[PDB]
Amino acid sequence: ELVKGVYAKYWIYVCAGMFIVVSFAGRLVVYKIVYMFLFLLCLTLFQVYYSLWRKLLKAFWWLVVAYTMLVLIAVSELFSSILVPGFFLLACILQLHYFHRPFMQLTDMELELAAGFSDVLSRVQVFLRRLLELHVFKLVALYTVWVALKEVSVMNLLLVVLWAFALPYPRFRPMASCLSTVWTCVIIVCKMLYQLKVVNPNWFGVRKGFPNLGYIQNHLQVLLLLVFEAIVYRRQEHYRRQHGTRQQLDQDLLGCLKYFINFFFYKFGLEICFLMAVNVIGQRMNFLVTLHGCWLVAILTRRHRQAIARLWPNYCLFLALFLLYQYLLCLGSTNLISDFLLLLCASQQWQVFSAERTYLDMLKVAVFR
Amino acid sequence: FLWMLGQALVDELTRWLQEFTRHHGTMSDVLRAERYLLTQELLQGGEVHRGVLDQLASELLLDRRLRIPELEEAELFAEGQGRALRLLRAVYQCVAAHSELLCYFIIIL
Amino acid sequence: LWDCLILYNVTVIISKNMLSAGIIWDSVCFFFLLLQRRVFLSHYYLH
| DSSP per-residue codes, B1-39 | -HHHHHHHHHHHHHHHHHHHHHHHHHHTTSSSTTS----
Rounded Cα gap, residues A75 and A78, in angstroms: 8
Suggest the residue from B35, B39, B43 to mutate for an interface test with chain C (most C CBs closer than 10 A).
Answer: B43
Please choose, from the candidates A264, A272, A268, A287, the residue with its C-alpha nearest in 3D space to the C-alpha of residue A335. Answer: A287
Residue of B nearest to A367 (CA): B38
Q: What is the DSSP letter of B106?
A: H
List Cβ neighbours of C7 (8 Å cut-off, separation of 6 or more). Answer: A300, A301
Rounded Cα gap, residues A66 and A34, in angstroms: 9
Angle, in degrees to the nearest 10, between helices A58-73 and A38-48: 170
Angle, in degrees to the nearest 10, between helices A334-353 and A312-330: 160
In this structure, are residues A11 and A103 in contact, taking their beta carbons and an 8 Å threshold? yes
Q: How was this structure determined?
A: cryo-EM
In this structure, are residues A323 and A336 in contact, taking their beta carbons and an 8 Å threshold? yes
| Cβ neighbours of A70 (radius 10 Å) | 20
Torsion of CA A162, A167, A172, A173, to 10 degrees: 90
SS3 B56: coil
Most distant pair of Cα atoms in chain B: their distance: 53
Please choose, from the candidates A330, A62, A294, the residue with its C-alpha nearest in 3D space to the C-alpha of residue A204. Answer: A330
Angle, in degrees to the nearest 10, between helices A288-300 and A312-330: 170
Which B residues, 41 through 100, put their C-beta within 8 Å of a C-beta on chain A? 41-42, 77, 80
In this structure, are residues A266 and A356 in contact, taking their beta carbons and an 8 Å threshold? yes
Q: Please measure the distance between the N-terminal and C-terminal CA atoms of chain B and give it in whole angstroms.
A: 37
Q: What is the DSSP letter of B72?
A: G
Q: Is A322 exposed, middle or buried (0-12, 13-18, 19+ CB in 10 A)?
A: buried
SS (H, E, C) chain A: CHHHHHHHHCCHHHHHHHHHHHCCCCCCCHHHHHHHHHHHHHHHHHHHCCCCCCCCCHHHHHHHHHHHHHHHHCCCHHHHHHHHHHHHHHHHHHHHHCCCHHHHHHCCCCCCHHHHHHHHHHHHHHHHHCCHHHHHHHHHHHHHHCCCCCCCCCHHHHCCCCHHHHCCCHHHHHHHHHHHHHHHHHHHHHHHCCCCCCCCCCCCCCCCCCCCHHHHCCHHHHHHHHHHHHHHHHHHHHHHHCCCCCCCCCCCHHHHHHHHHHCHHHHHHHHHHHHHHHHHHHCCCCCHHHHHHHHHHHHHCCCCHHHHHCCHHHHHHHHHHHHHHHHHHHCCCHHHHHHHHHHHHHHHHHHHHCCCCCCHHHHHHHHCC
Q: Which residues of A touch C34 (CB under 8 A)?
A: 271, 274-275
Q: Is B60 exposed, middle or buried (0-12, 13-18, 19+ CB in 10 A)?
A: exposed
∠ CA A240-A134-A164, rounded to 5°: 125
Rounded Cα gap, residues B53 and B30, in angstroms: 10
Q: What count of Cα atoms within 13 Å lies in the side-chain half-sphere of residue A3?
A: 0
Residue of B nearest to C42 (CA): B44
Please choose, from the candidates A271, A207, A240, the residue with its C-alpha nearest in 3D space to the C-alpha of residue A127. Answer: A240
Q: What is the DSSP letter of C42?
A: S
Q: What is the DSSP letter of B88?
A: H
In this structure, are residues B62 and B100 in contact, taking their beta carbons and an 8 Å threshold? no
| Cβ neighbours of A250 (radius 10 Å) | 15
∠ CA A128-A131-A137, rounded to 5°: 95
Region of A103 (left: φ > 0; alpha: ψ -120 to 50; beta: rest) is: alpha
Rounded Cα gap, residues C32 and A367, in angstroms: 11
Torsion of CA A175, A179, A184, A186, to 10 degrees: 170
Q: Is B27 exposed, middle or buried (0-12, 13-18, 19+ CB in 10 A)?
A: middle
Please choose, from the candidates A231, A245, A132, the residue with its C-alpha nearest in 3D space to the C-alpha of residue A181. Answer: A231
In this structure, are residues A88 and A35 in contact, taking their beta carbons and an 8 Å threshold? yes
| Cβ neighbours of A257 (radius 10 Å) | 12
Residue of A nearest to C15 (CA): A290
∠ CA A315-A351-A251, rounded to 5°: 125
Q: What count of Cα atoms within 13 Å lies in the side-chain half-sphere of residue B74?
A: 15
Please choose, from the candidates A98, A46, A41, A38, the residue with its C-alpha nearest in 3D space to the C-alpha of residue A67. Answer: A38
Q: Which residues of A touch C7 (CB under 8 A)?
A: 300-301
List Cβ neighbours of A292 (8 Å cut-off, separation of 6 or more). Answer: A277, A280, A281, A322, A339, A342
Residue of A nearest to C26 (CA): A278
- What radius of gyration do chain B's Cα atoms show? 17
Rounded Cα gap, residues A151 and A214, in angstroms: 11
Please choose, from the candidates A145, A144, A219, A150, the residue with its C-alpha nearest in 3D space to the C-alpha of residue A184. Answer: A219
Please choose, from the candidates A12, A29, A26, the residue with its C-alpha nearest in 3D space to the C-alpha of residue A71. Answer: A26
In this structure, are residues A270 and A305 in contact, taking their beta carbons and an 8 Å threshold? yes
In this structure, are residues A164 and A324 in contact, taking their beta carbons and an 8 Å threshold? yes
Rounded Cα gap, residues A151 and A163, in angstroms: 17
SS3 B89: helix
Most distant pair of Cα atoms in chain C: their distance: 48
Rounded Cα gap, residues C12 and A30, in angstroms: 58
- What radius of gyration do chain C's Cα atoms show? 13
Q: Is B71 on the interface with C (CB under 8 A)?
A: no
Q: What is the DSSP letter of C16?
A: H
Please choose, from the candidates A280, A276, A252, the residue with its C-alpha nearest in 3D space to the C-alpha of residue A348. Answer: A276
In this structure, are residues A86 and A67 in contact, taking their beta carbons and an 8 Å threshold? no
Rounded Cα gap, residues A178 and A173, in angstroms: 9
- CB spacing of C47 vs B37 below 8 angstroms: yes
In this structure, are residues A173 and A162 in contact, taking their beta carbons and an 8 Å threshold? no
Rounded Cα gap, residues A178 and A166, in angstroms: 12
- CB spacing of C47 vs B43 below 8 angstroms: no
- What resolution in angstroms, rounded to 1 decimal? 3.2
